[PDB]
UniProtKB/Swiss-Prot annotation, chain B:
This is Replication protein E1. Signal peptide: none annotated. It comes from Bovine papillomavirus type 1. It is found in: Host nucleus. Can form hexamers. Interacts with E2 protein; this interaction increases E1 DNA binding specificity. Interacts with host DNA polymerase subunit POLA2. Interacts with host single stranded DNA-binding protein RPA1. Interacts with host TOP1; this interaction stimulates the enzymatic activity of TOP1. Belongs to the papillomaviridae E1 protein family.
Length: 152, 75
DNA sequence: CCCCCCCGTGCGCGCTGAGGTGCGGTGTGAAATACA
């Protein structure tokens, strides 16, 4: 299982100071699917994180990732928006064949299309040095904080 | 390409003292490389009416500005 | 107790906002299928 629990959320907050319930919202139904997803993964080495942008940036319309931390536990936060929708079990198997960790530290929920912080978080992350973007941002963030007149 | 602000165009014209219609229109349309308002003006489909109004407003402003002066101050 | 004529057509370019209606992105479970 390990949909999204209080423990991962606590260290997520301790690192990026914004919740996972405020960037996504709720499904405990591990059957309901979606193409877009969010993810934060724990206990990762930076080399395979940089290679994670490498590997994933085949098959998704966008991909954002950012990294921490301070001597207390690493929370590599992803933003994943695949090409064809895949369930929490399928994307769970993908990422837990990706990151050489347990099924524990996965954070799978669809992103929330109406919400301010839900795109402010990634809009701030987009300027971070270790952030790795590919192509157009998904229409949710790329709707909430952008889609504004490029040159009036 | 934000909404055209006729006030800004008249302000620019009176800033440069351009008064006659042709100089206003041509000189403005040549300043589209830096003025967002310039591309805004070029986008619209009523350029002639706007330049006509801009010329008239600049004429009013210069006319009153000159007539305000007293002949000692004018000399 | 039933037919021998009335009758010559459609609108300021352009907006644009409250209004509500629906099949779905996503709402996400008790029932429901089958397992062992």
């Amino acid at each position: 299982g390990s949909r999204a629990t209080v423990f991962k959320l606590g260290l997520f907050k301790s690192l990026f100071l914004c919740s996972f319930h405020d960037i996504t919202r709720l499904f405990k139904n591990d059957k309901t699917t979606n193409q877009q997803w969010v993810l934060a993964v724990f206990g990762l080495a930076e080399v395979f994180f940089e290679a994670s942008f490498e590997l994933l940036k085949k098959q998704c319309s966008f991909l954002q990732m950012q990294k921490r931390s301070h001597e207390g536990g690493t929370c590599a936060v992803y933003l994943i928006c695949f090409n064809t929708a895949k369930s929490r079990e399928t994307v769970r198997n993908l990422m837990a064949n990706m990151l050489n960790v347990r099924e524990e530290c996965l954070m799978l929920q669809p992103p929330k299309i109406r919400g301010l912080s839900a795109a402010l978080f990634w809009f701030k992350s987009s300027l971070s040095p270790a952030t790795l973007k590919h192509g157009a941002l998904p229409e949710w963030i790329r709707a909430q904080t952008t889609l504004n007149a490029a040159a009036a | 390409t934000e909404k055209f602000d006729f006030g800004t165009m008249v302000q620019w014209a009176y800033d440069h003292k351009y008064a006659e219609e042709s100089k206003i229109a041509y000189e403005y349309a040549l300043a589209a490389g830096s003025d967002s308002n310039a591309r805004a003006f070029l986008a619209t489909n009523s350029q002639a009416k706007h330049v006509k109004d801009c010329a008239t407003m600049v004429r009013h402003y210069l006319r009153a500005e000159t007539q305000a002066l007293s002949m000692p101050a004018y000399i």
